[model samples]
Target: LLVPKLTASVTDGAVGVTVDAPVSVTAADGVLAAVTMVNDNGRPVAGRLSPDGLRWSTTEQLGYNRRYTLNATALGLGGAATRQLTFQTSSPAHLTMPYVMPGDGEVVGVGEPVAIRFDENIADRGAAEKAIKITTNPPVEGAFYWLNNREVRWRPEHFWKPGTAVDVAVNTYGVDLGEGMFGEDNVQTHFTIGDEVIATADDNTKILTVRVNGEVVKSMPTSMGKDSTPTANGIYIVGSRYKHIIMDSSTYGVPVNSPNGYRTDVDWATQISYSGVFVHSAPWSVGAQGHTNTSHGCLNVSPSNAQWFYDHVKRGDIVEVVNTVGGTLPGIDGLGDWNIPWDQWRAGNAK
Candidate 1:
């Protein structure tokens, strides 16, 4: 039996394509007759022959949003034929949301970078950047940084003028991004940059004045560890969170008997600094919290206050540190993000 080989349009995912012959055939001969199809992967690409002898089709879809091949064979009635073909689908659209905090569409900090990252690989760097158009409520000049073929980020020449409302238009539709990729069908994001959270940490007084909307929210008295266990003073942001985790001594390659080193399980852990540092609750060390600072250099807070800080602070919230009996906080902490003066940051972007 000879059948009309299956073929299809990319629009419907290869569904409803046909094979060459009708379904039934009776051959009393021991060789009954049959028809089947397979791909280069030896996987089946379905197509059923209609009883009409005119159209043979299949509802079976190809591989999962990727390239695939199909081959068909029709046998019976003293005849046979074979065929093979390759098929693929256009890439799906993706969105690259900006990683700014309190993500409302308004005011932002001078330290903030206009950054956007994608979960999907971006093959068309120029097109993707061009498509990601940014319009400030007041407008500002900026450029994009292609971190890699998969990640592209953007930043302005300077901290967006505080209070500048911005709109992000992600024209991800139909643009061929590479590796069979595409942008989101229609992506639109808007956010307002709020006032800068610039606060001075006075190490001499051991006070951390929290600020919001550029106003002092609270000025709390705190204690840093001893000279040997000083809290780092610098700018840091709330990077991520964790409900609970075990502090592993091995993580720092510290042996069990090392001074100020101990393995412990911490619950309700909210990591603020990325340098293996966290702003978490330590009930067992309440004595060491306010009086004599004694931690592995992390800011140990009362269970109550730690929870309050975690609840109030959003991811990317700013945390400025100043005085601590211990050594200064490493600038390598996420603090150095925007510390590079505007001109320096611009230079980095230019390079």
Candidate 2:
């Protein structure tokens, strides 16, 4: 009798287990002789033995919905002994494929958040949140907020500092997210916070003021939504930019040709809200700019100013509207995360 007995994990004949479960062997009182792991297809898995020869572990990832076996040989006090174990992973009834945005190598505004939008709606809200990680350079504090069933985002305690580098990693591979839904794959995205480009427009002033890094650059006249359709007021992170867009009132429930409705073509559009609000070229409204609010709900800027803005304002930049009667932008509307107070923002962390 020379060596002690051995023990291994993912117990023999285990079923419906996570593929990530460690396939390990331990022999604290003795020395491990060797270990072998193979998938159903008879392909060998990569594993390593401890420097002390007391343990062995598989380092390779296992495929989903597959069967695998683990065999370990160790020198025990009773001489050589071998043991085997088998496990199976079940096919997920549902899948959530995460897509991280502000995508790889992008330069976005400081206002941008690290958002993961899943292809499928997730009922188990807390599951993905628990596995998502946001790493930042210079160390910024943030928290998770569920935008809806399919999306979750993290925003810094304050707007990201210009030049901050952010890396988002969703290590939810093989994770069980309830309702038979499993993560389709692990994902990651890396982006840097670009310049601090911010634009502010107050309804009373009827001007869109642009600033870069705390310096006022441009103060362009603007005409916000008129009486019945006042533009919502609050901080909004700019989204996609377009060369041309046709704003149709019917899209927002106003019938084109109606008194308050019109199908208008505008250029140099920068989207601000999901519900059809933009800071776009409205050359026709130059007459009303800085004097009156005449737009349906958008900020009507001169063609030149709009083009300048569309070119300068990066995605995730701040485009805030203040002093309007239409009320604060709903934190859930567009990128209105900054509108939510810190207390309420972190109050409901799924993690």
Candidate 3:
């Protein structure tokens, strides 16, 4: 009697198999009838059988230290035979994962940049960048800038066109990220660009004009920094917001008791710069706003104006300052990369 023979890459009760290594079955003297692989939890494993029905293999990498079961059947002229196998994958020494900014299914402003942060510092950035994929509805060209060993950012040459849909995928699962660090999982995010809101403030005039989609929306009195702690001039993007927060000089390494130091509670604060700059309500500075500058480096507005602005502003909204004694804001200040010339920003990409 001629019966089909079944061969397995893994022996019964095998251990220490590489997670990414292929787990396959081959039949001799006959074609394969079926190949079903499953985890110990009874979840089906994704795999495919060869066109000739002689081989079957898993398509995805296995989980570390996870036990998997394989049941295969083959048919020959004489009879049918069945084979069962079980194995466990080896545990990795280190696992790394990537976290994307803007969050999943979030809506952001035009000035927002796509940021990717890794749990482990990657020495080979090119490999890491290749694993990332971006798709846009309107189709825009962008470049990735390595902020540091563990962080990288992507932004279009200019602000994202209003109403653009962005989709990002990080296929890092089972990928080698150097130094024995293997990726533990893949990540995906989807976001959309909302309206275009740009606010311009001049230190000389001490007023801010808000515009949405190229039309003037609101004009509010503003108080910029004094000569000592002059407000930085240049373009900035809105960051996180707070309904109420404690503004402390000690946060920026200044003593609370110093002449330029303060520890005050503020309302409707919107971050504009990474260097402790905000647009917030300042009832005490109402008399100074639209008259004289008195803040450390923030833009102060009336309580009502602050609340209105906070409610309307979104992350990636542009804020441009002019005529301030302080020099231009650095490109590293929050999402200030828009301040960099297109040619210069492109040149900064290491890749």
Candidate 4:
């Protein structure tokens, strides 16, 4: 061997941190049989001696938020010659904690997903993925899904079981996330899924019955849409929610002043259906809330009463149907979570 050569570079940062280096050795009398490349930490990353005995390269996730030292050693006509180099890792881009909907710290339903978004461009997403954890009293298996580099979410892949007690933890302290970033320290959140509530809307009687655990809690009269603008019926789940919404007559082809389509605004809105249906305060429809069906198709409640429902309801609560005037029943929308039956829910897992 005459002259041995070695070189390296960081190539890609998509999924894994990529690294490459090259080396060359001249083969002469008494040439050694092999060469090995290791890190300063004494970890062997690459090893082998070619027929000609010349070069080597390595590709691995660069240690996150860490300083890595690499060394290359080659055998020569005389002895082992080695080259050493070092580089430091990055830290996480941004972090926030105790994130709650409406920033109100309002206790929410069991179906709600407690979410956190990190601002860092995660190179080793799996590191963060493995670091964030979720636990429940029932021992559920959940996975962290990547929404983007700056955002990844962890969910059970299904709405939490009713009345389940769940806890979430993000332990990113000292975790290298690549690009000179390390995760923040651990965070914990605990919440309980509430008892299931069922709102059974029956066509025969034109009434909505609210139930808790199969027992009746409240029953009220409701007016759906007119014969033409009727309410659709089906099994449903709470999708998105709002405390207030404007009732616009223009969207439904009704004049703003027409009694059929007034410009009256609604407040304390708890949206139960995606087609603009809610159980909200209806002070304007005093006589129609429980006695006559007067809404465009919503289940109207007195403003005072709607507040009670709003405070009590949680996402993922069930709403079944028998009647209503809409043409076809739509699928549940809030999180599209009901699509997973218990058995199918169990299969989408990787232990």
Candidate maximizing TM-score: 2
TM-score of 2: 0.89
User: After TM-score superposition, what is the CA distance of residue 313 in candidate 4 from its true location, in Å?
Assistant: 3.2
lDDT score at residue 264, model 4, on the 0-100 scale: 59
Please provide TM-scores, in order, for all candidate models, with all chains considered together: 0.52, 0.89, 0.81, 0.52
Query: After aligning candidate 2 to the native by TM-score, how far in Å is the CA of 287 from where it should be?
Result: 1.5
RMSD from true fold, candidate 1: 12.4
Where does model 1 exceed 4 Å of error?
1-112, 119-128, 141-163, 172-187, 195-201, 213-215, 223-232, 240-270, 290-293, 323-336, 349-351
Angstrom error at residue 129, model 3: 0.9
RMSD of each: 12.4, 2.6, 4.4, 11.4
Q: What local lDDT score does residue 172 receive in model 1, on the 0 to 100 scale? A: 57
Model 4 local distance difference test score: 0.57
| Model 4: residues with Cα > 4 Å off, grouped in runs | 1-85, 90-107, 113-132, 141-163, 170-188, 225-264, 273-276, 284-297, 314-316, 325-332, 339-351
105-155: candidate 3 lDDT, tens digit per residue: 888888988888898888667777788899989999987777677877888
- lDDT over C-alpha atoms for residue 89 of model 4: 40
Reference-based lDDT, residue 339, model 1: 38
**lDDT, candidate 4, residue 38?**
47
- 158-232 in candidate 4: lDDT tens per residue? 556776766766676555655545655456667777776777777667667888777988776655555666666
Model 3 stretches astray by more than 4 angstroms? 1-31, 34-61, 65-92, 255-259, 348-351
- Score candidate 4 by TM-score against the native: 0.52
The lowest-lDDT stretch of 10 consecutive residues in candidate 4 is 11-20
Output the lDDT of residue 178, model 4.
Answer: 57
